[PDB]
Amino acid sequence: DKICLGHHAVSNGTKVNTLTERGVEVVNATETVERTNVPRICSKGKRTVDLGQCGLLGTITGPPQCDQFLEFSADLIIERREGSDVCYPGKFVNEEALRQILRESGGIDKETMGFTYSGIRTNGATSACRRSGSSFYAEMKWLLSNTDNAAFPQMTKSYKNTRKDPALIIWGIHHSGSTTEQTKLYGSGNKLITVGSSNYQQSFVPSPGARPQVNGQSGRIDFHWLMLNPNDTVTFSFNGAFIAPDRASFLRGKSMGIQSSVQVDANCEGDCYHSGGTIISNLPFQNINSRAVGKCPRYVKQESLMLATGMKNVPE
Amino acid sequence: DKICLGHHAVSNGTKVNTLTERGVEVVNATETVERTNVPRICSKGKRTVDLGQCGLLGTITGPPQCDQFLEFSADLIIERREGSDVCYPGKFVNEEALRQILRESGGIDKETMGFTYSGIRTNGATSACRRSGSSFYAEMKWLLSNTDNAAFPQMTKSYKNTRKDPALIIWGIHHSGSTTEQTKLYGSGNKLITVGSSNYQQSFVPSPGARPQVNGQSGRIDFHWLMLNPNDTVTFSFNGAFIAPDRASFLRGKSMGIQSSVQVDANCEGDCYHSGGTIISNLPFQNINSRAVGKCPRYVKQESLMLATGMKNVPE
Amino acid sequence: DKICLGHHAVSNGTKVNTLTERGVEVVNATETVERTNVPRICSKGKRTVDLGQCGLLGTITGPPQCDQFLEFSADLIIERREGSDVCYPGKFVNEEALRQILRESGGIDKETMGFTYSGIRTNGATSACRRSGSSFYAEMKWLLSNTDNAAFPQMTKSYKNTRKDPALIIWGIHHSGSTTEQTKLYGSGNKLITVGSSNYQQSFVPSPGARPQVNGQSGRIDFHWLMLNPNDTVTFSFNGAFIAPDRASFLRGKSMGIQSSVQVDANCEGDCYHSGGTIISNLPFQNINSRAVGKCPRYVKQESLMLATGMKNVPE
Amino acid sequence: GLFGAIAGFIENGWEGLIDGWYGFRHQNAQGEGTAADYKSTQSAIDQITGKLNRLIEKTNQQFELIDNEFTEVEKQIGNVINWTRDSMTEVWSYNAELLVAMENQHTIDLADSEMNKLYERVKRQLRENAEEDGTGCFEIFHKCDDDCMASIRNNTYDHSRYREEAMQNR
Amino acid sequence: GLFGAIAGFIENGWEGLIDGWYGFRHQNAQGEGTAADYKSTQSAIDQITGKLNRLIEKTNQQFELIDNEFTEVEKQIGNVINWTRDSMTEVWSYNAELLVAMENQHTIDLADSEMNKLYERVKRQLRENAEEDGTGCFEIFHKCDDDCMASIRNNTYDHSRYREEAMQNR
Amino acid sequence: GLFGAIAGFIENGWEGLIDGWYGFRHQNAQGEGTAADYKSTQSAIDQITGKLNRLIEKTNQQFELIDNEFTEVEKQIGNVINWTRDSMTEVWSYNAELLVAMENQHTIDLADSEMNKLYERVKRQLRENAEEDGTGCFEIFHKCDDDCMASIRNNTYDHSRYREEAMQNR
Ligand SMILES: *[C@@H]1O[C@H](CO)[C@@H](O[C@@H]2O[C@H](CO)[C@@H](O)[C@H](O)[C@H]2NC(C)=O)[C@H](O)[C@H]1NC(C)=O
Ligand SMILES: *[C@@H]1O[C@H](CO)[C@@H](O[C@@H]2O[C@H](CO)[C@@H](O)[C@H](O)[C@H]2NC(C)=O)[C@H](O)[C@H]1NC(C)=O
Ligand SMILES: *[C@@H]1O[C@H](CO)[C@@H](O[C@@H]2O[C@H](CO)[C@@H](O)[C@H](O)[C@H]2NC(C)=O)[C@H](O)[C@H]1NC(C)=O
Ligand SMILES: *[C@@H]1O[C@H](CO)[C@@H](O)[C@H](O)[C@H]1NC(C)=O
Ligand SMILES: *[C@@H]1O[C@H](CO)[C@@H](O)[C@H](O)[C@H]1NC(C)=O
Ligand SMILES: *[C@@H]1O[C@H](CO)[C@@H](O)[C@H](O)[C@H]1NC(C)=O
Ligand SMILES: *[C@H]1O[C@H](CO)[C@@H](O)[C@H](O)[C@H]1NC(C)=O
Ligand SMILES: *[C@H]1O[C@H](CO)[C@@H](O)[C@H](O)[C@H]1NC(C)=O
Ligand SMILES: *[C@H]1O[C@H](CO)[C@@H](O)[C@H](O)[C@H]1NC(C)=O
């Protein structure tokens, strides 16, 4: 006598929002915002370097904690809160720029600057940098006057980059904890260091004085850097208080750098990382960490945005 | 004999734009872009500090016009065009960073640095900073040699931050209008000031010379700042030309800072501010000021975007 | 007996994407992403200045290659890879800020600083800047001691901006390739240059030393700049190693600056430019160059996004 | 519109209809009369109201000053800030324009939909007892007094009561 | 919905319909029976599946760190970065909200559309042999056994076979 | 499509229809003939044209260089610029993709709507004088010559003239 048309329905629908209404109940729906974090750095298949105690900028200068990271190779570089760039206290000028360069480097290759010295000492060492006895930054040389109080000679040292890629060149200016210490190490007088390339132009005069003790030392070293272009030359004209580079650094290729507080895991894979771990998801959005890096779902403020995958639910 | 279906209509409809047509007339519509400004800073219910003649950075150093703002407390801080940071002429290094810090501070609390002095004068004063007679920045001390021409002694002064929040530490370097004035105030010789913390590393040598007269003075003071972390120490090693801090500053909490040319009004409330007043609106967009701050409708280029709230209008 | 309704169709439809399906075939469609570049700078109707060998910053100082660009007027300014700012080697502090200013300037007008000199030489010249014989930056004066080794006198020079717009003021600090050269040119002693306005406060001490040879010279000049406000004064207090400005620069109006490697063409017009040419298009998006400037379609990653302009194509 | 009723087969709207959005206008022995439909009107109003509830607000997202109107920031960073702000202005102006155009298209189509639904609902009520005119009018074959018209509006109309005489009056 | 079938003239859905999205429920001399419609169900499913294929992904766009959680960057540049990041957060949160709301509106209307299309397809099959109830039901005038009902579902129904008796039973 | 006419109950389109978008194809004693419908075609064309008028443009918003291709800017600020530019690229690529997908869905549904409206308009004209086939065809019961077919197309058709003979030929 009659045939009637209809559609399915369920007792327990799922609420979604539309242009016209909040909390419309539909037969089924699915989440578009990722909330689940994996509390590990998911590193399966990636050449990974976990710096631990070594500060990223220490890979260039070489305090004792960075001895095993002087020429690393990596797809993924992990900095840790406990990492330190220094042994004898000090810091890099333009430090974060240099960190950003090294994070993307793919690692570093090192080559000798070819500097030889006469008329001065080359073996400055300190109890702040220990390798079973007093020592110093593995990639640098603390140049001193031949004997106590002696005049450091006016020196010039040159290095040409004969490779096809830019060379990362570092040096340091030593600020003793006192003027008397400055004289004892490098002789009296107002010291000077100039550094120039075809691209670069900058000078340095030391300023000794008492800083509060760090790693048992009241002196400081100002570290500085420049990228030396292929077949360009850097000249160092100095007359004391100069921490000379022993080796130049070259970038190997490409990598990504992260900062994290969680363990590496080679059993999971992911490309979106933050300090608390890895966001593994195919969803378009995430509400886990606005500073996640790599290849990530877009960060949004909402905890949940349900996408309807069914018709409106109309139970009897 | 017949029943006929229909819909309402009006003589005077409102035009809107659609995906497919410009200026479609609909029964009613409403504006989505705010154009109405309130020409006052609507400050009802908010702890408000209108700086007037006091420059925001003056709250830290204390020229005479900032005497009533040395320890203010605020939810909303208002800078005015007439505000000045200085009395004796000069300026802060990294000035805008420091303004951004102070705008968000919730105000400042001050505590003594605990510096005491011997062998030098502590009461440098100038006609540029008047408090019924020559005076100086209320939070700073102009250190001079005991008598004219006398050698200023090589000095070191230390302050540890024993509080749970970072301390804002300021100092100044005085550049006299001439070398002779520099000798008269601090004795002859090339002067030096170093400043270091566990986080910070920087030096200063003065450069005297004739600048054009500002507030009747051809000399200048370079003001400098750093945030001193909890249980870290700052050391000042100086030998003249040094404007010493008398007090450290501490941030109270949270605030917002604005720049405006209009009067405060405690009879209206709003959270979106610009130099010309307050945008009070629940509309999603505004075309009043692209630099409005606080909690605002999004700035857009269009003067009007009408949202249809009725059907298409079809009059006979 | 019957009338039947239908719609048109074609054998060769065009595929588009919808919300619900990829590659739906429609009767017709049109591209929304521009892929066609014009390999020329399309400059019809615009006052255009192609700098060629002249570096943009050279227009202010005046090395020989910029002799015809000392007072240019322009709507469109074109920098070339071969452009150089210098003759005697050196560089500007805050160089890119100054380039951004000059790119938007509409060109420059020059006016004498009105500086006259006594007791010193004014005609320093070099083989690095040739104009049929040794010469120097056309807008600057290389101030030397009257004779070899002689003491340069402590000097002050003042300029007030009496115009209604800010004046661009430049100067240079000369760093000789050696200390002996510095003494020969300006006499012995540690030199000093201070510069101040009501807005500006900064100092300079030279640092001589061997840099690698550029344009046959191991010395360098540090160029510096400031904008001098209407009815403000700049004072130069110097005692050697100072490259003095002969003229102030004033901005003419408005322009746009580009960098390009292709020829100008006055037969085509366009407002979107990049190094490879001009994007001439009315389409909303382009996939040619993410760094295109002017008035451009938005850059997107997709090569093509077809917009349906017909119904779904349903062939028999 | 998509449903071809408003500004479609219905020639025009009624300025006299001040009681609702959609309504009935009848012709019978007793004369002419107009009445608004509550359900259709209310469905359209509630949906438009829902759109406004969504759109008419701003976020709790606070932004602070990053430049300075009294003392200009350094030129390079200032130019980066301006470029970023202008880029955001472009994004939001585009977003605003498209949002309102999309919403407006949907709003007009939605109203047209409600009109169509009301028409088809009445059509089903009057099966065989009436025929479509084509102007949004239903020609009724049997005599339909005010109580009969009110029964159609109130959805209490019984077609079986009149079917015989209406079918005979084909 | 826009088409007024689901949550419209069809009073409610069937919890017993576990075989598909849309289906037939009949009444005849042989009793009652329920069967799902494959084509309508599959069209709706394929369209929803298509939406998910588009949305459920992230781009191959890599971003690196530009600030530092261990050692804070300089305050001015840090504030520019935060302002930019917060601006992007606002843009994307707005984009996400609107995308899902738009998609959801369309998804519900799309399902309602498929239900309507199925109803009208059946209506055309049964021309003159049946009449619309108004509840999504077709009252058939001739006797229609399970083979007859199955022919309607399977789209093999021949109205000319039954037309005479059904037309007579007007 | 949402209206189930194009790629729906109408099996396929006509390659021979080169005169318009929508048209009529008839069968009578005099033979077969095809003619395009101006109003429906023009409504669809004007709406698509309107979309193009909106989309096919760029803004008057000028942007300047903030970095440098010949002499690289400082690395930190350069990285901030690149991050910002890449973020904008992501926003705009997303915007472009979604805009075109949304517009395309609407364009296809809009064309399908116009086809449906034309069908229902004809259905109303021919009340009782014809019946729906289900393939987009109207079986007419009375004899309809070329002048009669032309009257349907031209919207001058008078159903009352033929009603008696057509109703008799039920
Ligand atoms: C960034 O944009 C602002 C405006 O948004 C520019 O400042 C304006 O400059 C014009 C003319 O130069 C004045 O009329 C206005 O008073 C200024 N407005 C504000 C709010 O300050 C500013 O110059 C731009 N920044 C840079 C670096 O050029
Ligand atoms: C920029 O925003 C970050 C957070 O996104 C701020 O850093 C946070 O600071 C709060 C309290 O000051 C701490 O609880 C968090 O540990 C910090 N988070 C991170 C990720 O560092 C930061 O202060 C802001 N930048 C500036 C210049 O103020
Ligand atoms: C910012 O991005 C640009 C490209 O948009 C980078 O410059 C490119 O560098 C690659 C290889 O290093 C070259 O092949 C191109 O010639 C460069 N393109 C341009 C337009 O200059 C640039 O290195 C990035 N910035 C930073 C700070 O890394
Ligand atoms: C309903 O949606 C979820 C996605 O969140 C899915 O996992 C599940 O299989 C779906 N269930 C049915 C019956 O379709
Ligand atoms: C029409 O819209 C405006 C909103 O701009 C509103 O204030 C007014 O009450 C509305 N009028 C009617 C009759 O709905
Ligand atoms: C189809 O579209 C293109 C736009 O890409 C246009 O140039 C062409 O004229 C159109 N053809 C027809 C027949 O409409
Ligand atoms: C640098 O000079 C050497 C000459 O020995 C040449 O082989 C190399 O190609 C040069 N590279 C560049 C970038 O000029
Ligand atoms: C600083 O040292 C004191 C020891 O007196 C301790 O109470 C305080 O917790 C320390 N704070 C930090 C941050 O180490
Ligand atoms: C500068 O001073 C002169 C006085 O001769 C005056 O004409 C001019 O308006 C002043 N400009 C400003 C900006 O104060």
The DSSP line for C52-67 is TTB-TTHHHH--GGGG
Tokens matching residue A4 = 């009637």
Residue numbers in D near F99 (CB within 8 A)? 98
Amino acid identity, position C159: Y
Cα C134 from Cα C127, distance rounded (Å): 5
Cα F42 from Cα F46, distance rounded (Å): 6
Using CA of residue C133, residue C137, residue C140, residue C141, what is the dihedral sign? negative
Closest by Cα among B61, B247, B245, B235 to B155 = B235
DSSP C273: E
- Cβ atoms of B285 and B297 within 8 Å: the answer is yes
DSSP A308: E
Q: Which of A235, A262, A289 is the last residue of a domain?
A: A262
**F107 CB-contact burial (10 Å; exposed 0-12 / middle 13-18 / buried 19+):** buried
Cα E94 from Cα E115, distance rounded (Å): 32
Residue F127 — left, alpha, or beta (φ > 0 → left; ψ -120 to 50 → alpha)? beta
Best residue in C190, C200, C203, C226 to probe B by mutation, most B CBs within 10 Å? C203
Q: E65 and A293: CB-CB below 8 Å?
A: yes
For a mutational test of ligand 3's pocket, the pick from C96, C258, C261, C291, i.e. the residue with the most ligand atoms closer than 8 A to its C-beta, is: C291
C37 touches chain B (CB under 8 A): no
CA distance F73 to chain E (A): 15
Report the relative pairing of strands C120-121 and C108-112 from DSSP bridges.
Answer: unpaired
- Give me the number of domains chain E comprises: 1
Quote the distance between the C-alpha of residue E39 and its chain's center.
12
- Cβ atoms of A307 and A29 within 8 Å: the answer is yes
CA of B160 to the centre of ligand 8 (A): 11
CA distance B224 to chain C (A): 13
In chain C, the residue whose alpha carbon lies closest to the alpha carbon of B219 is C196
Cα F161 from Cα F169, distance rounded (Å): 14
D105 backbone dihedrals φ, ψ, rounded to 5°: -55, -50
Segment 274-313 of chain C within 8 Å of chain E by CB: 301
- Residue A123 neighbours by CB distance under 10 Å: 10
In this structure, the answer to whether residues C186 and C172 fall within a common structural domain is yes
- Cβ atoms of C191 and C239 within 8 Å: the answer is yes
Cα C305 from Cα C285, distance rounded (Å): 9
Radius of gyration, alpha carbons of chain E: 27
CA of A231 to the centre of ligand 7 (A): 6
B22 touches chain F (CB under 8 A): yes
Cα C284 from Cα F51, distance rounded (Å): 13
Closest by Cα among C129, C117, C125, C114 to C248 = C114
Cα E55 from Cα F94, distance rounded (Å): 11
Closest by Cα among A24, A7, A285, A61 to A171 = A61
Cα F64 from Cα C292, distance rounded (Å): 9
In this structure, the answer to whether residues B253 and B275 fall within a common structural domain is no
- Residue D145 neighbours by CB distance under 10 Å: 11
From the CA of F79, give the closest atom in ligand 3: 27
Which residue(s) pair with C278 in the sheet?
A: C38, C273
Alpha-carbon separation of residue F132 from A43, F24, F38, F140 (angstroms)? 65, 15, 23, 9
Alpha-carbon separation of residue C289 from C119, C293, C300, F57, F89 (angstroms)? 57, 9, 9, 18, 11
Cα D153 from Cα D162, distance rounded (Å): 16
Report the relative pairing of strands A298-299 and A285-286 from DSSP bridges.
Answer: parallel
In this structure, the answer to whether residues C147 and C242 fall within a common structural domain is yes
In this structure, the answer to whether residues A34 and A106 fall within a common structural domain is no
Cα C43 from Cα C41, distance rounded (Å): 6
Resolution in A: 2.1
Using CA of residue E63, residue E66, residue E72, residue E75, what is the dihedral sign? negative
A21 touches chain D (CB under 8 A): yes
Closest by Cα among A154, A170, A159 to A120 = A154
Which residue(s) pair with B235 in the sheet?
A: B158, B196
- Cβ(C230) to ligand 9 under 6 A? yes
For a mutational test of ligand 2's pocket, the pick from A274, A291, A293, i.e. the residue with the most ligand atoms closer than 8 A to its C-beta, is: A291
Best residue in F97, F106, F107, F112 to probe D by mutation, most D CBs within 10 Å? F106
Cα B73 from Cα B62, distance rounded (Å): 16
CA distance C197 to chain B (A): 7
Structural domain boundaries, residue F24 = 1-170
Instruction: List, as own/partner pairs, every contact residues A199-205 make where C-beta atoms lie below 8 angstroms and the sequence separation is at least 24, other chains included.
Output: A199/A226, A199/A229, A199/A232, A200/A226, A200/A234, A201/C90, A201/C91, A201/C175, A201/C211, A201/C220, A201/C222, A203/C175, A203/C207, A203/C209, A204/A173, A204/C207, A205/B205, A205/C205, A205/C207
E114 backbone dihedrals φ, ψ, rounded to 5°: -60, -35
- Cβ atoms of A102 and A74 within 8 Å: the answer is no
In this structure, the answer to whether residues B114 and B86 fall within a common structural domain is yes
Quote the distance between the C-alpha of residue A263 and its chain's center.
18
Quote the distance between the C-alpha of residue A174 and its chain's center.
23
Cα C301 from Cα A303, distance rounded (Å): 29
Give the CA angle between residues C270, C274, C276 to the nearest 5°: 100
Structural domain boundaries, residue B28 = 1-46+263-316
Segment 46-75 of chain D within 8 Å of chain B by CB: 48, 51-52, 55-71, 73-74
Q: Which ligand is nearest to the CA of A310?
A: 4
Tokens matching residue C45 = 């109707």
C4 touches chain F (CB under 8 A): yes
Q: B20 and F51: CB-CB below 8 Å?
A: yes
In this structure, the answer to whether residues C99 and C33 fall within a common structural domain is no
- Cβ atoms of C219 and C174 within 8 Å: the answer is yes
Q: A311 and E44: CB-CB below 8 Å?
A: yes
Amino acid identity, position B226: L
- Cβ atoms of A168 and A225 within 8 Å: the answer is yes
Q: At what angle do helices A95-103 and F75-125 cross, to 10 degrees?
A: 60
Residue numbers in F near E120 (CB within 8 A)? 4, 9
Alpha-carbon separation of residue A234 from A97, C15, C270, E45 (angstroms)? 20, 58, 44, 68
**C248 CB-contact burial (10 Å; exposed 0-12 / middle 13-18 / buried 19+):** buried
DSSP C164: S
CA of C253 to the centre of ligand 1 (A): 14
Indicate which residue's Cα is closest to atom 2 of ligand 1: D82
Instruction: List, as own/partner pairs, every contact residues F129-133 make where C-beta atoms lie below 8 angstroms and the sequence separation is at least 24, other chains included.
Output: F129/F159, F129/F162, F129/F163, F129/F166, F129/F167, F130/C2, F130/F166, F131/E127, F131/E128, F132/E124, F132/E127, F133/C2, F133/C4, F133/E124
Cα C283 from Cα D134, distance rounded (Å): 43
Cα E108 from Cα E112, distance rounded (Å): 6
Tokens matching residue F1 = 């499509």
Cα A177 from Cα A174, distance rounded (Å): 10
Using CA of residue A260, residue A264, residue A270, residue A271, what is the dihedral sign? positive
Chains that touch E (3 or more CB pairs under 8 A): A, B, C, D, F
Residues 6+ apart with CB under 8 A from E39: none
Radius of gyration, alpha carbons of chain D: 27
- 3-state SS, one letter per residue, for chain D: CCCCCECCCECCCECCCCCCCEEEEEEECCEEEEEECHHHHHHHHHHHHHHHHHHCCCCCCEECCCCCCCCCCCHHHHHHHHHHHHHHHHHHHHHHHHHHHHHHHHHHHHHHHHHHHHHHHHHHHCCCCEEECCCCEEEECCCCCHHHHHHHHCCCCCHHHHHHHHHHCC
- Cβ atoms of E152 and E35 within 8 Å: the answer is no
From the CA of A290, give the closest atom in ligand 2: 5
CA of C230 to the centre of ligand 3 (A): 40
Tokens matching residue A68 = 């095993």
- Cβ atoms of C253 and C265 within 8 Å: the answer is no
- For residue F44, give the H/E element and its range: helix F38-55
F47 backbone dihedrals φ, ψ, rounded to 5°: -75, -40
Residues 6+ apart with CB under 8 A from D112: B311, B312, D1, D2, D3, D4, D5, D6, D7, D8
DSSP B214: B
B20 touches chain F (CB under 8 A): yes
Cα A117 from Cα A121, distance rounded (Å): 8
Tokens matching residue A265 = 């895991």
Strand order in the sheet with B285-286: B33-34, B285-286, B298-299
Cα D126 from Cα D140, distance rounded (Å): 8
- Residue E156 neighbours by CB distance under 10 Å: 10
In this structure, the answer to whether residues C174 and C274 fall within a common structural domain is no
Using CA of residue B262, residue B266, residue B267, residue B268, what is the dihedral sign? positive
Which residue(s) pair with F140 in the sheet?
A: F130
- Cβ atoms of F109 and F2 within 8 Å: the answer is yes
Closest by Cα among C254, C248, C261 to C70 = C248
Cα E39 from Cα E30, distance rounded (Å): 26
β strands within F108-147, DSSP E: 130-132, 137-140
Cα B33 from Cα C97, distance rounded (Å): 35
Residues 6+ apart with CB under 8 A from B197: A211, A212, B226, B228, B229, B232, B233, B234, B235
In this structure, the answer to whether residues C36 and C98 fall within a common structural domain is no
Tokens matching residue B209 = 């010379």
- Give me the number of domains chain C comprises: 2
DSSP B58: H
In this structure, the answer to whether residues A33 and A119 fall within a common structural domain is no
Tokens matching residue C232 = 């403000």
DSSP E162: H
In chain C, where does DSSP find H-type helix?
58-61, 95-103, 179-186
Q: F77 and D80: CB-CB below 8 Å?
A: yes
Exposure class string for F53-79: b at 16+ Cβ within 10 A, else e: ebbeebeeeebbbbbeeebebeebbbb
Longest dimension (CA), chain D: 91
Closest by Cα among E157, E154, E146 to E124 = E157
CA distance A183 to chain F (A): 36
- For residue C300, give the H/E element and its range: none
Q: Which ligand is nearest to the CA of C12?
A: 6
Which residue(s) pair with B5 in the sheet?
A: D24
Q: What is the DSSP string of E42-106?
A: HHHHHHHHHHHHHHS---S-EE---S-SSSPPPHHHHHHHHHHHHHHHHHHHHHHHHHHHHHHHH
Which residue(s) pair with C233 in the sheet?
A: C160
Instruction: List, as own/partner pairs, every contact residues E92-98 make where C-beta atoms lie below 8 angstroms and the sequence separation is at least 24, other chains included.
Output: E92/A285, E92/A298, E92/A299, E92/A300, E92/F91, E93/A300, E93/A301, E93/A302, E93/D59, E94/D95, E95/A298, E95/F91, E95/F94, E96/A32, E96/A33, E96/A284, E96/A285, E96/A298, E96/A300, E96/A302, E96/A305, E97/A302, E97/A305, E98/D99
- For residue F83, give the H/E element and its range: helix F75-125
CA distance A21 to chain D (A): 5
Residues 6+ apart with CB under 8 A from C113: C159, C169, C244, C245, C246, C247, C248
Alpha-carbon separation of residue E128 from D13, D121, D166, E160, F169 (angstroms)? 34, 20, 17, 10, 13
Q: C190 and A194: CB-CB below 8 Å?
A: no
Question: Residue with structure tokens 């929803």?
Answer: E48
| CB-based pocket (< 6 A), ligand 1 | B 291; D 69, 75, 78-79, 82
Residues 6+ apart with CB under 8 A from C70: C59, C62, C108, C110, C138, C139
- Cβ atoms of D15 and B9 within 8 Å: the answer is yes
Give the CA angle between residues A297, A299, A303 to the nearest 5°: 105
CA distance A217 to chain E (A): 22
Distance from the first to the final alpha carbon of chain C: 24
Closest by Cα among C238, C240, C236 to C160 = C236
From the CA of F69, give the closest atom in ligand 3: 21
- Cβ(C30) to ligand 6 under 6 A? yes
- Residue A302 neighbours by CB distance under 10 Å: 13
- For residue C134, give the H/E element and its range: strand C134-135
Q: E135 and A4: CB-CB below 8 Å?
A: yes
Distance from the first to the final alpha carbon of chain F: 33
Best residue in B19, B207, B213 to probe C by mutation, most C CBs within 10 Å? B207
Cα A212 from Cα B195, distance rounded (Å): 10
Report the relative pairing of strands A41-42 and B14-16 from DSSP bridges.
Answer: unpaired
Residue numbers in E near A26 (CB within 8 A)? 104, 107-108
**A304 CB-contact burial (10 Å; exposed 0-12 / middle 13-18 / buried 19+):** exposed
CA of B120 to the centre of ligand 5 (A): 77
Amino acid identity, position C205: V
- Cβ(B28) to ligand 5 under 6 A? yes
- Cβ atoms of A266 and A44 within 8 Å: the answer is yes
Chains that touch F (3 or more CB pairs under 8 A): A, B, C, D, E
In this structure, the answer to whether residues A155 and A223 fall within a common structural domain is yes
In this structure, the answer to whether residues A267 and A248 fall within a common structural domain is no
- Cβ atoms of A63 and A86 within 8 Å: the answer is yes
Report the relative pairing of strands B76-79 and B48-50 from DSSP bridges.
Answer: parallel
Tokens matching residue A299 = 């960060």
SS3 breakdown of chain E: % helix, strand, coil, rounded to 5?
50, 15, 35
Q: A192 and C209: CB-CB below 8 Å?
A: yes
CB-facing half-sphere around the CA of C111: CA atoms within 13 A? 12
Q: For residue E42, what is the domain's CATH number?
A: 3.90.20.10
In this structure, the answer to whether residues A93 and A77 fall within a common structural domain is yes
- For residue F86, give the H/E element and its range: helix F75-125
CB-facing half-sphere around the CA of B157: CA atoms within 13 A? 21
Amino acid identity, position B209: G
Radius of gyration, alpha carbons of chain C: 29
